[PDB]
Amino acid sequence: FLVHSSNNFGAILSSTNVGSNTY
Amino acid sequence: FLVHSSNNFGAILSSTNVGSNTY
Amino acid sequence: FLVHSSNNFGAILSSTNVGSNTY
Amino acid sequence: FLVHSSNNFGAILSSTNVGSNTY
Amino acid sequence: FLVHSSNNFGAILSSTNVGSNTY
Amino acid sequence: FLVHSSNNFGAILSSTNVGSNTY
Amino acid sequence: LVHSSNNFGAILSS
Amino acid sequence: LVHSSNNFGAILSS
Amino acid sequence: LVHSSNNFGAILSS
Amino acid sequence: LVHSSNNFGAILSS
Amino acid sequence: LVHSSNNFGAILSS
Amino acid sequence: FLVHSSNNFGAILSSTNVGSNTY
Amino acid sequence: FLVHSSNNFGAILSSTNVGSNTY
Amino acid sequence: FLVHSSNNFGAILSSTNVGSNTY
Amino acid sequence: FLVHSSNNFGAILSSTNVGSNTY
Amino acid sequence: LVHSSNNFGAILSS
Amino acid sequence: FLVHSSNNFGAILSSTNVGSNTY
Amino acid sequence: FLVHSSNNFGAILSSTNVGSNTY
Amino acid sequence: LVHSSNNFGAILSS
Amino acid sequence: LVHSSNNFGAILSS
Amino acid sequence: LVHSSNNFGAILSS
Amino acid sequence: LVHSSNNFGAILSS
Amino acid sequence: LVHSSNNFGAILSS
Amino acid sequence: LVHSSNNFGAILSS
């Protein structure tokens, strides 16, 4: 058998910025 | 058998910004 | 047998902004 | 047998903005 | 047998804005 | 049997910025 | 005393 | 005393 | 006393 | 007394 | 007294 | 005086997909 | 004086999809 | 004086889909 | 005086995908 | 008294 | 006087993917 | 006087992927 | 012969 | 012969 | 013969 | 013969 | 014969 | 004969 187990107990803050390109 | 288990117990804050491109 | 199990117990705040492009 | 189980017990706030493009 | 089970016990606030484009 | 186990108990802060290119 | 067998749903006892 | 067998739905006991 | 067998769902007892 | 056998889900007892 | 056998999920007892 | 001038003479194809999140 | 001038001479195809979330 | 001028000379095709959420 | 001038003469193809997160 | 056998998940007892 | 001039004469293909996170 | 001049005459292909994180 | 003075709009002559 | 002065609109001559 | 003075818009002559 | 003075816009002559 | 003075925009003559 | 004075933009003659 195959078992994928993910357990998260903490706060996560993710910020992603893509852009600001001048052509 | 195959078991995918996802467990999240914490606050998650995600911000994504795409754009601001001048052509 | 195959088992997909998703369990979320925490607050989630997601903000997505796409745009602001000048041509 | 195949079992998809989704369980959400927390508040979710999602904001999506698309637009603000000048041509 | 195949079982899709969705269970939501929390408040959900979704805001979507599309538009504000000048041509 | 094969077992993938991921356990996170700490706060995670990730910031990603891609862009700011002038052509 | 709560006994649950083959629980695929969400069970909430208070 | 709550006994549930083959529960695929949502059970809420208060 | 909480006894759970073959629990694939989410069980919340308070 | 909490006894869990073959628990693949999330169990929360408070 | 908490006894867990074959626990693949997340168990939280408080 | 202040002059904002935007001139677009080419075809623009924009595709945006937001979603497909399981909780 | 202040002058905002927008001029578009090309075809524009925009597709936006928001949704497909399971709770 | 203030002058907002918008001029569009090209075909525009916009498709927006919001929904398909299961709770 | 201040002059912002944007001139685009080429085809632009932008694809943005945000999502596919399992909690 | 906490007894855990074949624990592949995360167990948190407080 | 201040002059911002942007001139683009070439095809631009931008692809952005954000997501695919398991918690 | 101050003059910012950007001139692009070539094809640009940009691909950005952010994500695929397991917690 | 096309003469345009202070053109803020779009002028198309064919 | 097309002469336009202070054109803020769209002028189309064919 | 095309003469343009103070052109802030887009002029297209074909 | 194309003469342009103070051109801040886009001029296209074909 | 193309004469351009104080050209801040894009001029395309073909 | 192409004469350009104070060209800050892009000029393309073909």
Author numbering:
A (entry chain R), B (entry chain N), C (entry chain J), D (entry chain F), E (entry chain B), F (entry chain V), ...: 15 to 37
G (entry chain H), H (entry chain D), I (entry chain L), J (entry chain P), K (entry chain T), P (entry chain X), ...: 16 to 29
Give verbatim excerpts from the published study on this entry:
Islet amyloid polypeptide (IAPP, or amylin) is a 37-residue peptide hormone that is cosecreted with insulin and one of the most amyloid-prone sequences known. Overproduction and aggregation of IAPP leads to amyloid deposition in the islets of Langerhans, a pathological hallmark of type-2 diabetes. Although the precise link between IAPP aggregation and disease remains uncertain, IAPP aggregates have been shown to be toxic in cell-based assays, and genetic and animal studies implicate islet amyloid in the progressive loss of pancreatic β-cell function. Over 40 different proteins, with diverse native structures or in many cases intrinsic disorder, form amyloid associated with human disease, yet all amyloid fibrils share a common cross-β architecture consisting of a continuous intermolecular β-sheet supported by networks of zipper and ladder-like interactions. Amyloid fibrils have a similar cross-β architecture, but fibrils formed by a single protein sequence can have diverse structures, varying with time, self-assembly conditions, and sequence modifications.
Virtual screening, ThT assays, and biophysical characterization successfully identified two widely used FDA-approved drugs, canagliflozin and doxazosin, as inhibitors of IAPP amyloid formation. Cryo-EM was performed on fibrils assembled from 30 μM IAPP in the same buffer used for kinetic assays (160 mM ammonium acetate, pH 7.4, 1% v/v DMSO), in the absence (4 replicates) or presence (2 replicates each) of 50 μM YX-I-1, canagliflozin, or doxazosin. Fibrils with a similar morphology were observed for the control (no small molecule) and doxazosin-containing samples, with the majority having a twisted ribbon morphology and crossover distances of 60–100 nm. The majority of fibrils formed in the control (69%) and doxazosin-treated (72%) samples were classified into three related fibril structures (named LL, LLU, and LLUU, respectively), which have a shared structural core consisting of a pair of protofilaments related by a 21-screw symmetry. Each protofilament is formed from a single stack of L-shaped IAPP subunits, with straight β-strand segments encompassing 13ANFLVHSSNNF23 and 25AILSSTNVGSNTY37-NH2, hinging on a turn at Gly24. In addition, further flanking subunits presenting U-shaped IAPP subunit conformations and ambiguous β-strands were observed adhering to these two β-sheets, with the combinations of these flanking subunits differing to generate the three individual polymorphs LL, LLU, and LLUU. Thus, out of the fibril structures that were identified in each data set, YX-I-1 fibrils consisted of 89% C-fold subunits, whereas this subunit fold was absent from fibrils grown in the control or with doxazosin. By contrast, the control and doxazosin-treated samples consisted of L-fold (62% or 72%, respectively), U-fold (34% or 28%), and S-fold (4% or 0%) subunits.
